[PDB]
Swiss-Prot record, chain A:
Binds to host ACE2. RBD also interacts with the N-linked glycan on 'Asn-90' of ACE2. Cleavage of S generates a polybasic C-terminal sequence on S1 that binds to host Neuropilin-1 (NRP1) and Neuropilin-2 (NRP2) receptors. Interacts with host integrin alpha-5/beta-1 (ITGA5:ITGB1) and with ACE2 in complex with integrin alpha-5/beta-1 (ITGA5:ITGB1). May interact via cytoplasmic c-terminus with M protein. May interact (via N-terminus) with host bilirubin and biliverdin, thereby preventing antibody binding to the SARS-CoV-2 spike NTD via an allosteric mechanism. Attaches the virion to the cell membrane by interacting with host receptor, initiating the infection. The major receptor is host ACE2. When S2/S2' has been cleaved, binding to the receptor triggers direct fusion at the cell membrane. When S2/S2' has not been cleaved, binding to the receptor results in internalization of the virus by endocytosis using host TFRC and GRM2 and leading to fusion of the virion membrane with the host endosomal membrane. Alternatively, may use NRP1/NRP2 and integrin as entry receptors. This is Spike protein S1.
From Swiss-Prot, chain B:
It comes from the Viruses. It comes from Severe acute respiratory syndrome coronavirus 2. Glycans are attached at N29. This is Spike protein S1. The gene is S. Binds to host ACE2. RBD also interacts with the N-linked glycan on 'Asn-90' of ACE2. Cleavage of S generates a polybasic C-terminal sequence on S1 that binds to host Neuropilin-1 (NRP1) and Neuropilin-2 (NRP2) receptors. Interacts with host integrin alpha-5/beta-1 (ITGA5:ITGB1) and with ACE2 in complex with integrin alpha-5/beta-1 (ITGA5:ITGB1). May interact via cytoplasmic c-terminus with M protein. May interact (via N-terminus) with host bilirubin and biliverdin, thereby preventing antibody binding to the SARS-CoV-2 spike NTD via an allosteric mechanism. Attaches the virion to the cell membrane by interacting with host receptor, initiating the infection. The major receptor is host ACE2. When S2/S2' has been cleaved, binding to the receptor triggers direct fusion at the cell membrane. When S2/S2' has not been cleaved, binding to the receptor results in internalization of the virus by endocytosis using host TFRC and GRM2 and leading to fusion of the virion membrane with the host endosomal membrane. Alternatively, may use NRP1/NRP2 and integrin as entry receptors.
Length: 49, 34
């Protein structure tokens, strides 16, 4: 692993989930049973590290 | 079902589940409301 950086366009391997983008702080509410998120049509919209 | 029947008569409901399709609604907090 490495260290994570926010609000800069990076590439990320979150537990085998490979994607690209800008990470920032989310006002959404994950319940503890949740593992990750998606919003519409299998695009991971939020992730808890 | 297992009871802690004290040495001295309890109510519950059981239904059987069936395969079919559903439409579920989520609110803001990621939970089910309808």
């Amino acid at each position: 692993s490495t260290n994570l950086v926010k609000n800069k366009c990076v590439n990320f391997n979150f537990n085998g989930l490979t994607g690209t983008g800008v990470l920032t702080e989310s006002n959404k509410k994950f319940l503890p049973f949740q593992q990750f998120g998606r919003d519409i049509a299998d695009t991971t919209d939020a992730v808890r590290d | 079902t297992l009871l802690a029947l004290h040495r001295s008569a309890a109510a519950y409901y059981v239904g059987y589940l069936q395969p079919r399709t559903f439409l579920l609604k989520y609110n803001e907090n990621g939970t089910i409301t309808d």
